[PDB]
Amino acid sequence: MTEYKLVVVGACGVGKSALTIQLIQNHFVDEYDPTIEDSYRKQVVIDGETCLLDILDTARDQYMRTGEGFLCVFAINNTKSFEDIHQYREQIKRVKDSDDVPMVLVGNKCDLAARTVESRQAQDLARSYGIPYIETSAKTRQGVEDAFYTLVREIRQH
Ligand SMILES: *CCC(=O)N1CCN(c2nc(=O)n(-c3c(C)ccnc3C(C)C)c3nc(-c4c(O)cccc4F)c(F)cc23)[C@@H](C)C1
Ligand SMILES: Nc1nc2c(ncn2[C@@H]2O[C@H](COP(=O)(O)OP(=O)(O)O)[C@@H](O)[C@H]2O)c(=O)[nH]1
Ligand SMILES: [Mg+2]
């Protein structure tokens, strides 16, 4: 049984914790301590293979060095968090000395109306990085499994 080391990064308040908690426990957390950084484990079957996911919810050096894939999370109603994504990717590139790192761009809070980041904008950013873009709602669970499992499938191409 395989293990995949995943790291969830992005600006404050985008839903890093809510996404991770939704994935693990199938529950939307209305407020989760913004200072709690911890790693969580989750047994999954992905394309017929039993895997143990090891997920760091950032809020650390060891996981950046050995982490195999990163979720770059912004919120679709938080333009600053989207603009911040560049800086998070630059930090990952430095720690990995590579711009060929498994990553998925995640636009969270898709259940909220009147988005300020268009899907097109995010698709264009992900295209420039050569990575997938996936929209999620930690509230409704839409796309949550897709985001984490796609990151696994990106790691497997590596
Ligand atoms: C609401 C609280 C919250 O969720 N936070 C998330 C973690 N975090 C954070 N802040 C931050 O300034 N950097 C960072 C550093 C330390 C240096 C340069 N740039 C940045 C940002 C602007 C990209 C964070 N950097 C990382 C990170 C490192 O250090 C290495 C590789 C990959 C990374 F994502 C990180 F995980 C969190 C950073 C604050 C906002 C609190
Ligand atoms: N409506 C909605 N709210 C969300 C979603 N994800 C997170 N939130 C809310 O956004 C706030 C910040 O979420 P949190 O997980 O703590 O963000 P973090 O700082 O990146 O860990 C919380 O009040 C969450 O309830 C979502 O998909 N939809
Ligand atoms: Mg958090």
Residue numbers in the entry: 1 to 59, 68 to 166
From the manuscript:
To study whether other small GTPases also exhibit a targetable SII pocket, we first turned to the K-Ras paralogs H-Ras and N-Ras, which exhibit sequence homology in the SII pocket but differ in position 95 (Q95 in H-Ras and L95 in N-Ras). Both H-Ras and N-Ras can also harbor G12C mutations, which have been validated as cancer targets in pre-clinical settings. We found that some inhibitors were relatively selective for K-Ras(G12C) over H-Ras(G12C) and N-Ras(G12C) (e.g., ARS1620 or adagrasib), while others exhibited very effective labeling of each Ras paralog, with full modification in under 5 min (e.g., sotorasib, JDQ443, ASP2453). To study how the difference in residue 95 affects the binding pose of an SII pocket inhibitor, we solved the crystal structure of sotorasib-bound H-Ras(G12C). The Q95 residue is located in closer proximity to the sotorasib binding pocket, which leads to a slight shift in the binding pose closer to the unresolved SII loop. This suggests that the SII loop remains flexible in the presence of a SII ligand and may be less critical for pocket shape and ligand accommodation compared with residues found on the α3 loop. To study whether the effective SII pocket target engagement in H-Ras(G12C) and N-Ras(G12C) translates to inhibition and cellular activity, we characterized a small library of 10 compounds that were initially optimized for K-Ras(G12C) in biochemical and cellular settings. Both N-Ras(G12C) and H-Ras(G12C) exhibited markedly increased thermostability in their sotorasib-bound forms, as tested using differential scanning fluorimetry in the presence of SYPRO™ Orange. To assess functional inhibition, we tested the nucleotide exchange activity of unliganded and sotorasib-bound N-Ras(G12C) and H-Ras(G12C) using a fluorescent guanosine diphosphate (GDP) analog (BODIPY-GDP) in the presence of the guanine exchange factor (GEF) son of sevenless (catalytic domain, SOSCat) or ethylenediaminetetraacetic acid (EDTA). Sotorasib inhibited SOS-mediated exchange and significantly reduced the rate of EDTA-mediated exchange in both N-Ras(G12C) and H-Ras(G12C).
Ras GTPases are involved in proliferation and migration, and their aberrant regulation is implicated in cancers and developmental diseases, termed RASopathies. Recently, the discovery of a cryptic allosteric pocket (switch II [SII] pocket) in K-Ras4B has challenged this paradigm and enabled the rapid development of therapeutics to target K-Ras(G12C) mutant cancers, including the FDA-approved drugs LUMAKRAS (sotorasib)14 and Krazati (adagrasib)15 for the treatment of non-small cell lung cancer. Herein, we systematically map SII pockets across members of various GTPase families and find that, despite limited sequence homology, key elements of the SII pocket are conserved across the Ras, Rho, and Rab families of GTPases, enabling the targeting of many GTPases beyond K-Ras.
